[PDB]
Design a protein around this ligand. Structure first.
Ligand SMILES: Nc1nc2c(ncn2[C@@H]2O[C@H](COP(=O)(O)OP(=O)(O)O)[C@@H](O)[C@H]2O)c(=O)[nH]1
Ligand SMILES: [Mg+2]
Ligand SMILES: [Zn+2]
Lengths: 201, 27
């Protein structure tokens, strides 16, 4: 079986828990790791190369009070770093998370996600999002509550880890229905801004 | 000799009498 430990980090309140919980089977089959206060969510995705499982490590909030213990990071094979696009400070803390992660895990594949893009009053915009370009990281706007771009971080990571640029998901996993609407007009614009910013340097 | 941890699913070596990540015993 093909599985990877995926550590999910970022400032408290960025929506890491909401995000991982979108995946319904991941939620029903999650395992509690008492020693570390961690819930591990097995997220299966079906690709043209077979099933791939991301065991996503989600905190129980300890990140609000300081860095995470080494055991949390140990043996991680990939990661997502999340910040809140409606909170400049969460973006500002991103470098710290990268540092801590990399001190333990090194050059593992990492996706940077700006969450909560369903919100009209957006603080951290595409042209300000620059950390990923510096460190080799891929970026995606996401909205956990609307399922927007939910699958993109996992697809990029699967491609990187298997070493197959043509890897595809045969179908989307069963997800919790969108709690908020992600405006299609918005999603169109936010995608344009990102593209342009990526060609800005 | 490697074993998967029943508690957190991390793959460990046989030389480890408990999980490098969560410290859980090897079955
Ligand atoms: N509008 C909006 N709110 C969100 C989204 N994701 C999470 N939240 C809210 O952010 C708050 C904290 O979310 P939580 O998952 O606990 O963040 P965590 O501490 O990083 O795990 C909650 O009130 C969520 O409802 C999103 O995509 N859109
Ligand atoms: Mg949480
Ligand atoms: Zn373990």
């Amino acid at each position: 079986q093909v599985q990877f430990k995926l550590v999910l980090v970022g400032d408290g309140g960025t929506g890491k828990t909401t995000f991982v919980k979108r995946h319904l089977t991941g939620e029903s089959e999650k395992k509690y790791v008492a020693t570390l206060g961690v819930e591990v969510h097995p997220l299966v995705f079906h690709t043209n190369r077979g099933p791939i499982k991301f065991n996503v490590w989600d905190t129980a909030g300890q990140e609000k009070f300081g860095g995470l213990r080494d055991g949390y990071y140990i043996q991680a094979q990939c990661a997502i770093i999340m910040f809140d696009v409606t909170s400049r400070v969460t973006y500002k803390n991103v470098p710290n998370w990268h540092r801590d992660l990399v001190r333990v895990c090194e050059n593992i594949p990492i996706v940077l996600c700006g969450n909560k893009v369903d919100i009209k009053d957006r603080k951290v915009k595409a042209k300000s999002i620059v950390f990923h370009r510096k460190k080799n990281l891929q970026y995606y706007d996401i909205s956990a509550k609307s399922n927007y771009n939910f699958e993109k971080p996992f697809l990029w990571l699967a491609r990187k880890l298997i070493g197959d640029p043509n890897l595809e998901f045969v179908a989307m996993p069963a997800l919790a229905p969108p709690e908020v609407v992600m405006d299609p007009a918005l999603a169109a614009q936010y995608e344009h801004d990102l593209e342009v910013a990526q060609t800005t340097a | 000799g490697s074993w998967e941890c029943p508690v957190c699913c991390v793959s460990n070596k046989a030389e480890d009498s408990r999980c490098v990540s969560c410290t859980s015993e090897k079955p």
